[PDB]
mmCIF file with all atom_site columns, C-alpha atoms (C1' of nucleotides) in Angstrom:
data_model
loop_
_atom_site.group_PDB
_atom_site.id
_atom_site.type_symbol
_atom_site.label_atom_id
_atom_site.label_alt_id
_atom_site.label_comp_id
_atom_site.label_asym_id
_atom_site.label_entity_id
_atom_site.label_seq_id
_atom_site.pdbx_PDB_ins_code
_atom_site.Cartn_x
_atom_site.Cartn_y
_atom_site.Cartn_z
_atom_site.occupancy
_atom_site.B_iso_or_equiv
_atom_site.pdbx_formal_charge
_atom_site.auth_seq_id
_atom_site.auth_comp_id
_atom_site.auth_asym_id
_atom_site.auth_atom_id
_atom_site.pdbx_PDB_model_num
ATOM 1   C CA    . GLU A 1 1  ? 270.086 -143.039 265.294 1.00 0.00 ? 61  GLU A CA    1
ATOM 2   C CA    . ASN A 1 2  ? 267.601 -145.201 263.858 1.00 0.00 ? 62  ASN A CA    1
ATOM 3   C CA    . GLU A 1 3  ? 268.375 -147.237 267.336 1.00 0.00 ? 63  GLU A CA    1
ATOM 4   C CA    . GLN A 1 4  ? 266.665 -145.019 269.893 1.00 0.00 ? 64  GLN A CA    1
ATOM 5   C CA    . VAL A 1 5  ? 263.811 -144.904 268.490 1.00 0.00 ? 65  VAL A CA    1
ATOM 6   C CA    . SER A 1 6  ? 259.956 -146.496 270.222 1.00 0.00 ? 66  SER A CA    1
ATOM 7   C CA    . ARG A 1 7  ? 257.562 -149.106 268.277 1.00 0.00 ? 67  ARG A CA    1
ATOM 8   C CA    . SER A 1 8  ? 255.572 -145.556 268.643 1.00 0.00 ? 68  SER A CA    1
ATOM 9   C CA    . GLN A 1 9  ? 257.871 -143.660 266.766 1.00 0.00 ? 69  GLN A CA    1
ATOM 10  C CA    . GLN A 1 10 ? 258.574 -146.204 264.477 1.00 0.00 ? 70  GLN A CA    1
ATOM 11  C CA    . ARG A 1 11 ? 254.894 -146.931 263.574 1.00 0.00 ? 71  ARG A CA    1
ATOM 12  C CA    . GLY A 1 12 ? 254.096 -142.924 263.684 1.00 0.00 ? 72  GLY A CA    1
ATOM 13  C CA    . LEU A 1 13 ? 256.798 -142.405 261.035 1.00 0.00 ? 73  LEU A CA    1
ATOM 14  C CA    . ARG A 1 14 ? 255.392 -145.625 259.094 1.00 0.00 ? 74  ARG A CA    1
ATOM 15  C CA    . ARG A 1 15 ? 252.195 -144.203 258.537 1.00 0.00 ? 75  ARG A CA    1
ATOM 16  C CA    . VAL A 1 16 ? 253.391 -141.082 257.368 1.00 0.00 ? 76  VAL A CA    1
ATOM 17  C CA    . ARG A 1 17 ? 255.059 -142.659 255.162 1.00 0.00 ? 77  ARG A CA    1
ATOM 18  C CA    . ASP A 1 18 ? 252.245 -144.459 253.782 1.00 0.00 ? 78  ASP A CA    1
ATOM 19  C CA    . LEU A 1 19 ? 250.051 -141.537 253.699 1.00 0.00 ? 79  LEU A CA    1
ATOM 20  C CA    . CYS A 1 20 ? 252.648 -139.825 251.444 1.00 0.00 ? 80  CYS A CA    1
ATOM 21  C CA    . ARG A 1 21 ? 252.359 -142.913 249.034 1.00 0.00 ? 81  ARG A CA    1
ATOM 22  C CA    . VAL A 1 22 ? 248.807 -142.875 248.771 1.00 0.00 ? 82  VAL A CA    1
ATOM 23  C CA    . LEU A 1 23 ? 248.657 -139.018 248.257 1.00 0.00 ? 83  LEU A CA    1
ATOM 24  C CA    . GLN A 1 24 ? 251.514 -139.759 245.974 1.00 0.00 ? 84  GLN A CA    1
ATOM 25  C CA    . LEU A 1 25 ? 253.833 -136.726 247.296 1.00 0.00 ? 85  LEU A CA    1
ATOM 26  C CA    . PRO A 1 26 ? 257.103 -136.391 246.037 1.00 0.00 ? 86  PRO A CA    1
ATOM 27  C CA    . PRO A 1 27 ? 260.221 -138.095 248.080 1.00 0.00 ? 87  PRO A CA    1
ATOM 28  C CA    . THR A 1 28 ? 260.730 -134.891 249.100 1.00 0.00 ? 88  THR A CA    1
ATOM 29  C CA    . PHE A 1 29 ? 257.633 -134.259 250.500 1.00 0.00 ? 89  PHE A CA    1
ATOM 30  C CA    . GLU A 1 30 ? 258.135 -137.405 252.589 1.00 0.00 ? 90  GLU A CA    1
ATOM 31  C CA    . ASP A 1 31 ? 261.539 -135.603 254.214 1.00 0.00 ? 91  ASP A CA    1
ATOM 32  C CA    . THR A 1 32 ? 260.074 -132.800 255.128 1.00 0.00 ? 92  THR A CA    1
ATOM 33  C CA    . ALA A 1 33 ? 257.101 -134.867 256.351 1.00 0.00 ? 93  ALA A CA    1
ATOM 34  C CA    . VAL A 1 34 ? 259.267 -137.162 258.476 1.00 0.00 ? 94  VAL A CA    1
ATOM 35  C CA    . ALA A 1 35 ? 261.692 -134.162 259.834 1.00 0.00 ? 95  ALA A CA    1
ATOM 36  C CA    . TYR A 1 36 ? 258.496 -132.318 261.319 1.00 0.00 ? 96  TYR A CA    1
ATOM 37  C CA    . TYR A 1 37 ? 257.043 -135.574 263.030 1.00 0.00 ? 97  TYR A CA    1
ATOM 38  C CA    . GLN A 1 38 ? 260.096 -136.418 264.684 1.00 0.00 ? 98  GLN A CA    1
ATOM 39  C CA    . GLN A 1 39 ? 260.793 -132.283 265.240 1.00 0.00 ? 99  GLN A CA    1
ATOM 40  C CA    . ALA A 1 40 ? 256.820 -132.240 266.653 1.00 0.00 ? 100 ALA A CA    1
ATOM 41  C CA    . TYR A 1 41 ? 258.000 -135.737 268.817 1.00 0.00 ? 101 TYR A CA    1
ATOM 42  C CA    . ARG A 1 42 ? 261.009 -134.022 270.358 1.00 0.00 ? 102 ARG A CA    1
ATOM 43  C CA    . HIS A 1 43 ? 258.390 -132.322 272.551 1.00 0.00 ? 103 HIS A CA    1
ATOM 44  C CA    . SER A 1 44 ? 257.154 -134.574 275.620 1.00 0.00 ? 104 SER A CA    1
ATOM 45  C CA    . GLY A 1 45 ? 253.369 -132.647 275.453 1.00 0.00 ? 105 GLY A CA    1
ATOM 46  C CA    . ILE A 1 46 ? 253.302 -134.564 271.784 1.00 0.00 ? 106 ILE A CA    1
ATOM 47  C CA    . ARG A 1 47 ? 254.984 -137.958 272.992 1.00 0.00 ? 107 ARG A CA    1
ATOM 48  C CA    . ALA A 1 48 ? 253.525 -138.867 275.860 1.00 0.00 ? 108 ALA A CA    1
ATOM 49  C CA    . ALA A 1 49 ? 249.864 -138.101 273.663 1.00 0.00 ? 109 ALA A CA    1
ATOM 50  C CA    . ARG A 1 50 ? 246.671 -140.293 272.736 1.00 0.00 ? 110 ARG A CA    1
ATOM 51  C CA    . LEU A 1 51 ? 246.456 -141.864 269.750 1.00 0.00 ? 111 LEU A CA    1
ATOM 52  C CA    . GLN A 1 52 ? 244.567 -139.972 267.987 1.00 0.00 ? 112 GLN A CA    1
ATOM 53  C CA    . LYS A 1 53 ? 247.006 -136.949 269.188 1.00 0.00 ? 113 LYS A CA    1
ATOM 54  C CA    . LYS A 1 54 ? 249.643 -139.022 267.128 1.00 0.00 ? 114 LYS A CA    1
ATOM 55  C CA    . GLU A 1 55 ? 247.225 -139.461 263.992 1.00 0.00 ? 115 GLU A CA    1
ATOM 56  C CA    . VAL A 1 56 ? 246.309 -136.277 264.246 1.00 0.00 ? 116 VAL A CA    1
ATOM 57  C CA    . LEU A 1 57 ? 250.089 -135.550 264.471 1.00 0.00 ? 117 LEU A CA    1
ATOM 58  C CA    . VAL A 1 58 ? 250.895 -137.299 261.330 1.00 0.00 ? 118 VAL A CA    1
ATOM 59  C CA    . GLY A 1 59 ? 247.809 -134.892 259.918 1.00 0.00 ? 119 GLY A CA    1
ATOM 60  C CA    . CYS A 1 60 ? 249.156 -132.197 260.951 1.00 0.00 ? 120 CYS A CA    1
ATOM 61  C "C1'" . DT  B 2 1  ? 178.397 -116.004 192.588 1.00 0.00 ? 1   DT  B "C1'" 1
ATOM 62  C "C1'" . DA  B 2 2  ? 179.538 -114.586 197.312 1.00 0.00 ? 2   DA  B "C1'" 1
ATOM 63  C "C1'" . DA  B 2 3  ? 178.464 -113.729 202.868 1.00 0.00 ? 3   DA  B "C1'" 1
ATOM 64  C "C1'" . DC  B 2 4  ? 177.462 -115.116 207.493 1.00 0.00 ? 4   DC  B "C1'" 1
ATOM 65  C "C1'" . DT  B 2 5  ? 175.923 -118.795 210.668 1.00 0.00 ? 5   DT  B "C1'" 1
ATOM 66  C "C1'" . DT  B 2 6  ? 177.108 -123.014 212.032 1.00 0.00 ? 6   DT  B "C1'" 1
ATOM 67  C "C1'" . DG  B 2 7  ? 181.204 -127.260 214.150 1.00 0.00 ? 7   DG  B "C1'" 1
ATOM 68  C "C1'" . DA  B 2 8  ? 185.419 -129.362 216.342 1.00 0.00 ? 8   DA  B "C1'" 1
ATOM 69  C "C1'" . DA  B 2 9  ? 189.243 -127.987 216.402 1.00 0.00 ? 9   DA  B "C1'" 1
ATOM 70  C "C1'" . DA  B 2 10 ? 194.532 -125.315 218.228 1.00 0.00 ? 10  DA  B "C1'" 1
ATOM 71  C "C1'" . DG  B 2 11 ? 196.971 -123.023 222.096 1.00 0.00 ? 11  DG  B "C1'" 1
ATOM 72  C "C1'" . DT  B 2 12 ? 196.926 -120.671 224.444 1.00 0.00 ? 12  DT  B "C1'" 1
ATOM 73  C "C1'" . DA  B 2 13 ? 196.509 -118.690 228.389 1.00 0.00 ? 13  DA  B "C1'" 1
ATOM 74  C "C1'" . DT  B 2 14 ? 195.913 -118.341 233.128 1.00 0.00 ? 14  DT  B "C1'" 1
ATOM 75  C "C1'" . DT  B 2 15 ? 195.003 -120.346 237.625 1.00 0.00 ? 15  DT  B "C1'" 1
ATOM 76  C "C1'" . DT  B 2 16 ? 196.174 -123.512 241.033 1.00 0.00 ? 16  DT  B "C1'" 1
ATOM 77  C "C1'" . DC  B 2 17 ? 198.953 -127.567 242.740 1.00 0.00 ? 17  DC  B "C1'" 1
ATOM 78  C "C1'" . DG  B 2 18 ? 203.278 -130.526 243.913 1.00 0.00 ? 18  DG  B "C1'" 1
ATOM 79  C "C1'" . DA  B 2 19 ? 207.816 -129.266 245.005 1.00 0.00 ? 19  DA  B "C1'" 1
ATOM 80  C "C1'" . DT  B 2 20 ? 212.135 -127.807 245.703 1.00 0.00 ? 20  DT  B "C1'" 1
ATOM 81  C "C1'" . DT  B 2 21 ? 214.219 -123.735 247.730 1.00 0.00 ? 21  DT  B "C1'" 1
ATOM 82  C "C1'" . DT  B 2 22 ? 214.993 -119.897 250.854 1.00 0.00 ? 22  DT  B "C1'" 1
ATOM 83  C "C1'" . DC  B 2 23 ? 214.807 -118.865 254.874 1.00 0.00 ? 23  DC  B "C1'" 1
ATOM 84  C "C1'" . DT  B 2 24 ? 214.888 -119.102 259.816 1.00 0.00 ? 24  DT  B "C1'" 1
ATOM 85  C "C1'" . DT  B 2 25 ? 216.481 -121.866 264.479 1.00 0.00 ? 25  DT  B "C1'" 1
ATOM 86  C "C1'" . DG  B 2 26 ? 219.971 -123.815 268.107 1.00 0.00 ? 26  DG  B "C1'" 1
ATOM 87  C "C1'" . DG  B 2 27 ? 224.792 -124.887 269.507 1.00 0.00 ? 27  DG  B "C1'" 1
ATOM 88  C "C1'" . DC  B 2 28 ? 229.452 -125.758 268.684 1.00 0.00 ? 28  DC  B "C1'" 1
ATOM 89  C "C1'" . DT  B 2 29 ? 233.537 -124.750 266.947 1.00 0.00 ? 29  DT  B "C1'" 1
ATOM 90  C "C1'" . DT  B 2 30 ? 236.931 -122.091 268.663 1.00 0.00 ? 30  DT  B "C1'" 1
ATOM 91  C "C1'" . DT  B 2 31 ? 241.152 -118.027 272.126 1.00 0.00 ? 31  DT  B "C1'" 1
ATOM 92  C "C1'" . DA  B 2 32 ? 242.674 -117.121 276.274 1.00 0.00 ? 32  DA  B "C1'" 1
ATOM 93  C "C1'" . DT  B 2 33 ? 243.783 -118.370 283.100 1.00 0.00 ? 33  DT  B "C1'" 1
ATOM 94  C "C1'" . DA  B 2 34 ? 243.916 -121.240 286.493 1.00 0.00 ? 34  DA  B "C1'" 1
ATOM 95  C "C1'" . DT  B 2 35 ? 241.063 -123.641 289.541 1.00 0.00 ? 35  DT  B "C1'" 1
ATOM 96  C "C1'" . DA  B 2 36 ? 241.451 -129.275 290.865 1.00 0.00 ? 36  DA  B "C1'" 1
ATOM 97  C "C1'" . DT  B 2 37 ? 240.762 -135.360 290.566 1.00 0.00 ? 37  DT  B "C1'" 1
ATOM 98  C "C1'" . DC  B 2 38 ? 239.174 -141.159 288.239 1.00 0.00 ? 38  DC  B "C1'" 1
ATOM 99  C "C1'" . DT  B 2 39 ? 241.001 -144.503 285.639 1.00 0.00 ? 39  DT  B "C1'" 1
ATOM 100 C "C1'" . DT  B 2 40 ? 242.112 -145.419 281.485 1.00 0.00 ? 40  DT  B "C1'" 1
ATOM 101 C "C1'" . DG  B 2 41 ? 244.750 -143.108 276.744 1.00 0.00 ? 41  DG  B "C1'" 1
ATOM 102 C "C1'" . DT  B 2 42 ? 249.109 -144.437 275.801 1.00 0.00 ? 42  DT  B "C1'" 1
ATOM 103 C "C1'" . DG  B 2 43 ? 255.838 -144.735 276.600 1.00 0.00 ? 43  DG  B "C1'" 1
ATOM 104 C "C1'" . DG  B 2 44 ? 258.949 -147.359 276.275 1.00 0.00 ? 44  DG  B "C1'" 1
ATOM 105 C "C1'" . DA  B 2 45 ? 262.089 -151.898 277.961 1.00 0.00 ? 45  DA  B "C1'" 1
ATOM 106 C "C1'" . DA  B 2 46 ? 262.687 -156.342 278.027 1.00 0.00 ? 46  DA  B "C1'" 1
ATOM 107 C "C1'" . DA  B 2 47 ? 262.827 -161.044 275.969 1.00 0.00 ? 47  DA  B "C1'" 1
ATOM 108 C "C1'" . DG  B 2 48 ? 260.351 -165.643 275.114 1.00 0.00 ? 48  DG  B "C1'" 1
ATOM 109 C "C1'" . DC  B 2 49 ? 260.905 -171.122 252.628 1.00 0.00 ? 49  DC  B "C1'" 1
ATOM 110 C "C1'" . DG  B 2 50 ? 263.181 -172.795 248.965 1.00 0.00 ? 50  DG  B "C1'" 1
ATOM 111 C "C1'" . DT  B 2 51 ? 264.688 -172.413 244.013 1.00 0.00 ? 51  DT  B "C1'" 1
ATOM 112 C "C1'" . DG  B 2 52 ? 267.846 -173.009 239.684 1.00 0.00 ? 52  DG  B "C1'" 1
ATOM 113 C "C1'" . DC  B 2 53 ? 271.871 -174.433 237.429 1.00 0.00 ? 53  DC  B "C1'" 1
ATOM 114 C "C1'" . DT  B 2 54 ? 276.047 -176.524 236.824 1.00 0.00 ? 54  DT  B "C1'" 1
ATOM 115 C "C1'" . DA  B 2 55 ? 278.769 -171.949 232.220 1.00 0.00 ? 55  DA  B "C1'" 1
ATOM 116 C "C1'" . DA  B 2 56 ? 283.006 -174.399 231.752 1.00 0.00 ? 56  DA  B "C1'" 1
ATOM 117 C "C1'" . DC  B 2 57 ? 287.320 -175.573 231.392 1.00 0.00 ? 57  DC  B "C1'" 1
ATOM 118 C "C1'" . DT  B 2 58 ? 292.809 -177.794 234.649 1.00 0.00 ? 58  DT  B "C1'" 1
ATOM 119 C "C1'" . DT  B 2 59 ? 294.130 -180.511 237.451 1.00 0.00 ? 59  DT  B "C1'" 1
ATOM 120 C "C1'" . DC  B 2 60 ? 294.177 -180.766 242.185 1.00 0.00 ? 60  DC  B "C1'" 1
ATOM 121 C "C1'" . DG  B 2 61 ? 294.260 -184.362 245.494 1.00 0.00 ? 61  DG  B "C1'" 1
ATOM 122 C "C1'" . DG  B 2 62 ? 291.819 -185.891 249.905 1.00 0.00 ? 62  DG  B "C1'" 1
ATOM 123 C "C1'" . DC  B 2 63 ? 289.854 -188.867 252.097 1.00 0.00 ? 63  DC  B "C1'" 1
ATOM 124 C "C1'" . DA  B 2 64 ? 285.694 -192.518 251.771 1.00 0.00 ? 64  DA  B "C1'" 1
ATOM 125 C "C1'" . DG  B 2 65 ? 285.669 -196.243 251.599 1.00 0.00 ? 65  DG  B "C1'" 1
ATOM 126 C "C1'" . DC  B 2 66 ? 286.282 -200.552 251.205 1.00 0.00 ? 66  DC  B "C1'" 1
ATOM 127 C "C1'" . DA  B 2 67 ? 288.359 -203.528 251.300 1.00 0.00 ? 67  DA  B "C1'" 1
ATOM 128 C "C1'" . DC  B 2 68 ? 291.926 -206.864 249.401 1.00 0.00 ? 68  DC  B "C1'" 1
ATOM 129 C "C1'" . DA  B 2 69 ? 295.702 -209.467 250.963 1.00 0.00 ? 69  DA  B "C1'" 1
ATOM 130 C "C1'" . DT  B 2 70 ? 298.328 -211.113 253.684 1.00 0.00 ? 70  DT  B "C1'" 1
ATOM 131 C "C1'" . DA  B 2 71 ? 301.048 -212.019 257.780 1.00 0.00 ? 71  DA  B "C1'" 1
ATOM 132 C "C1'" . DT  B 2 72 ? 300.646 -213.514 262.351 1.00 0.00 ? 72  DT  B "C1'" 1
ATOM 133 C "C1'" . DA  B 2 73 ? 298.464 -215.284 266.138 1.00 0.00 ? 73  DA  B "C1'" 1
ATOM 134 C "C1'" . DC  B 2 74 ? 295.141 -219.137 267.442 1.00 0.00 ? 74  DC  B "C1'" 1
ATOM 135 C "C1'" . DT  B 2 75 ? 293.549 -224.422 267.175 1.00 0.00 ? 75  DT  B "C1'" 1
ATOM 136 C "C1'" . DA  B 2 76 ? 293.134 -229.322 265.565 1.00 0.00 ? 76  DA  B "C1'" 1
ATOM 137 C "C1'" . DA  B 2 77 ? 295.988 -233.781 264.260 1.00 0.00 ? 77  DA  B "C1'" 1
#
DNA sequence: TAACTTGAAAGTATTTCGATTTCTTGGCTTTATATATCTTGTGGAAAGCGTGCTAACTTCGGCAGCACATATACTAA
């Protein structure tokens, strides 16, 4: 893995990690967040969505 | 040697006044279902500087270059 990933998904993951580190959440929280983000990205409706949509996806 | 009528002197009280609070209005958010269409929100796959120190031994150990010497072929007498 980490090779069949788009630049948009990579930016989303990096934003997730950045917000996690800003809120100072543990690495377990970081891992759970990235896992849930990947699980949500698996779907196509969220995959091909808006920029604000994917930002709110990071947030949620 | 007191007693009552003086005066400007306090609190003290209540009455209104500035102001901030409380009470009214809308209106949007959200729940589902599908009905339908413009441009512009993206997914994704490409592809056109910069340091320091040696950590020191051994014994290479080669080649760089160089370079010195000379044996030989060319030339003047």
